[PDB]
């Protein structure tokens, strides 16, 4: 197909962090995350938002209105992560994403292909998280799918440090003279004190 696919090992324990960490590392414009229940999608978006990820759920107990808003902040980039379910995830109103994550594995080819088909705006990415005792299941899914999936380890604690670190860098770079000029004088105060610790700490708040 026109997209890439990887299979990432993660104990259901640290399956959330892995998700987050993978997100920091690639940090794509739009990520679509599928899970098995409405509780999960909600449960999940909650853990993400906590870790510094603009994630919001997408399910059935959603009034078409809150669901246009959700898909609105997602299309505008306000929301970067969409934790969804196969059904809420259906329509014409469903925008395309850059990365697809099967937080829990799909039992059918049509399933995998309905979720995975939501990636590509030019080719895209697809990631599969699996617990240790989920091996065969992935082996079965592969057979249903017809293609095999590369086994890629999870992102390194340092891999993530440097990813966050480089996005923080790109952010400051985006700030404009009109907004940062308001603060130059305070910047001077810090230079004048020249205590490397204060600034490191300010950076620690952001990163």
43 binds Cl ion per the rule CB under 5 A: no
> Which of Cl ion, a second copy, none does residue 196 bind (CB under 5 to 8 Å by kind)?
a second copy
182 binds a second copy per the rule CB under 8 A: yes
Q: How far is the CB of 175 from a second copy (least distance, A)?
A: 4
204 binds a second copy per the rule CB under 8 A: yes
Q: Cα–Cα distances in Å, from 146 out to 30, 53, 166, 169, 171?
A: 27, 33, 37, 42, 42
Which SS3 state, helix, strand or coil, does residue 133 take? helix
> Which of Cl ion, a second copy, none does residue 133 bind (CB under 5 to 8 Å by kind)?
none
Kindly tell me which of 111 and 199 has the beta carbon lying closer to a second copy: 199
Q: Cα–Cα distances in Å, from 127 out to 8, 13, 55, 151, 206?
A: 7, 18, 17, 10, 27
177 binds a second copy per the rule CB under 8 A: yes
170 binds a second copy per the rule CB under 8 A: no
Kindly tell me which of 53 and 118 has the beta carbon lying closer to a second copy: 53
167 binds a second copy per the rule CB under 8 A: no
| Phi (first) and psi of residue 22, to 5 degrees | -70, -30
> Which of a second copy, Cl ion, none does residue 180 bind (CB under 5 to 8 Å by kind)?
a second copy
Among 6, 47, 114, 165, the residue binding a second copy under the rule CB under 8 A is 165
Q: What are the tokens at 9?
A: 């090992």
Taking the C-alpha atoms of residue 48 and residue 83, their distance in angstroms, rounded to an integer, is 9
179 binds a second copy per the rule CB under 8 A: yes
Asked whether the beta carbons of 166 and 27 are under 8 A apart, the reply is no
Taking the C-alpha atoms of residue 165 and residue 104, their distance in angstroms, rounded to an integer, is 29
Determine whether 99 is exposed, middle or buried from the number of CB atoms within 10 Å of its CB (0-12, 13-18, 19+). Answer: buried
Contact positions vs a second copy (CB under 8 A): 161, 165, 168-169, 171-173, 175, 177, 179-188, 190-191, 194, 196-207
Contact positions vs Cl ion (CB under 5 A): 12-13, 86, 114
């Amino acid at each position: 197909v026109t997209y890439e696919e990887e299979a990432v090992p993660a104990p259901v324990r640290g399956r959330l962090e892995v998700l987050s960490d993978l997100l920091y590392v690639a940090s794509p414009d739009r990520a679509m995350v599928f899970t098995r229940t409405k509780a999960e999608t909600e449960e999940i978006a909650q853990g993400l938002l906590r870790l510094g990820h603009p994630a919001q759920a997408l399910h059935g107990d959603l009034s078409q209105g809150e669901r246009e808003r959700v898909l609105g902040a997602f299309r505008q980039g306000e929301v970067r992560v969409l934790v969804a379910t196969d059904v809420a995830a259906r329509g014409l109103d469903i925008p395309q994403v850059d990365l697809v994550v099967h937080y829990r594995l799909p039992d059918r080819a049509e399933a995998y292909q309905h979720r995975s088909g939501r990636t590509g705006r030019a080719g895209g990415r697809v990631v599969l998280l699996y617990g240790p005792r989920e091996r065969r299941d992935v082996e079965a899914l592969e057979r249903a799918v017809g293609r095999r999936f590369k086994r890629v380890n999870p992102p390194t604690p340092e891999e993530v440090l440097e990813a966050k670190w480089r996005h923080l860098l790109a952010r400051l770079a985006r700030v404009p003279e009109k907004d940062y000029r308001l603060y130059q004088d305070f910047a001077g105060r810090l230079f004048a004190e020249g205590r490397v610790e204060v600034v490191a700490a300010l950076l620690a708040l952001l990163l």
